């Protein structure tokens, strides 16, 4: 058996790479985690031998640690590879961007002596630069998982574009709930206030999954985040609080000044 993890992108049908589509087409079996029923239909027309990974998420109000969900997803994928199947894992966006299942499956497959590789895809971050017309290189880019930012010590560079991913679960420590609470997001606001004013304009971004759908680009002051409608697919963009300032220290070592820059 063998494993190839691919991404389907955010948009229905068209945002997959030509090669990645081919991998899905020719696979013995596909393990899927796609955004909606239109995407699921499109996959099943491409290759009818599909196991939906959606089933491993907590069902009907059960208490389930997402760590157990992901373990079950990885085990399901590996059971097909161990059986001898040419296996493809088809995750939405990029299969290895804020997604542990493909990395874990590939690590486990290599350790058990199976061919395993990941094919890059178009992530939600890739869609943001396009939709907002922002270049990550303009003043730099930082990405953190919102809950990791709250639980561990991270220091943002406020000259960058900062992305907080999974903002809808920010502070949800149990890994058993589908969303956080207004009081948790107020604590995040107060934490961000170290670098960003309360009136600092932030953007709730949602890339479209359908070709008839506009992206969500909601501009609001940071102070209003805890009252905002958030979904699991919501990303929080925090544009720069400060303009770029000259590094006179390093310019001095290079023997130049700002007037010398091309």
């Amino acid at each position: 058996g063998s494993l190839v993890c691919v991404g389907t992108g955010l948009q229905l049908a068209g945002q997959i790479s030509v090669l990645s589509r081919s991998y899905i087409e020719h696979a013995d079996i596909v393990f899927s985690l796609l955004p909606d029923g239109f995407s699921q239909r499109w996959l099943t027309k491409l290759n009818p031998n599909v196991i939906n990974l959606q089933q491993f998420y907590a069902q009907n109000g059960e208490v389930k640690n997402r760590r157990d969900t992901y373990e079950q997803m990885v085990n399901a994928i590996l059971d097909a590879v161990r059986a001898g199947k040419k296996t493809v894992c088809a995750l939405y966006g990029h299969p290895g961007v804020f997604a542990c299942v493909s990395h874990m499956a590939i690590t486990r497959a290599k350790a058990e002596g199976f061919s395993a590789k990941m094919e890059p895809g178009i992530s939600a971050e890739a869609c943001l630069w396009a939709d907002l017309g922002i270049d990550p290189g303009n003043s730099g880019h930082q990405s953190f998982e919102a809950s990791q930012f709250m639980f561990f010590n991270h220091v943002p560079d406020p000259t960058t574009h900062l992305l907080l991913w999974q903002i809808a679960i920010a502070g949800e420590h149990t890994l058993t709930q589908f969303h956080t609470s207004s009081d948790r997001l107020q604590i995040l606001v107060e934490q961000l206030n170290q670098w960003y004013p309360l009136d600092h304009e932030v953007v709730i971004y949602e890339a479209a999954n359908l070709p008839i759908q506009a992206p969500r680009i909601e501009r609001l002051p940071l102070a209003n985040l805890p009252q905002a409608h958030l979904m699991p697919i919501s990303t929080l963009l925090i544009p720069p609080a400060k303009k770029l300032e000259y590094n006179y220290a390093i310019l001095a070592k290079l023997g130049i000044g700002p007037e010398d820059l091309g």
């Binding site: 959606q54 939405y92 953190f144 930012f149």
Partner: protein, 68 residues
Amino acid sequence: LSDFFTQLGQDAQLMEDYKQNPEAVMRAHGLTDEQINAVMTGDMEKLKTLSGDSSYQSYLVISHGNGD
């Protein structure tokens, strides 16, 4: 619905046709008035009901921030 969306999402000629006249293209592909109204209001829940899958529940978080 699913047939139209899948074509439109892959075909740059149909995409450019759609962007010029969305209502004319949706009607030419047989979309109902209520399907068109769902598109123009951006009601993604209604389109999911009309296609057959809003019974399909979809949670898309595949990672956590607790480490280990």
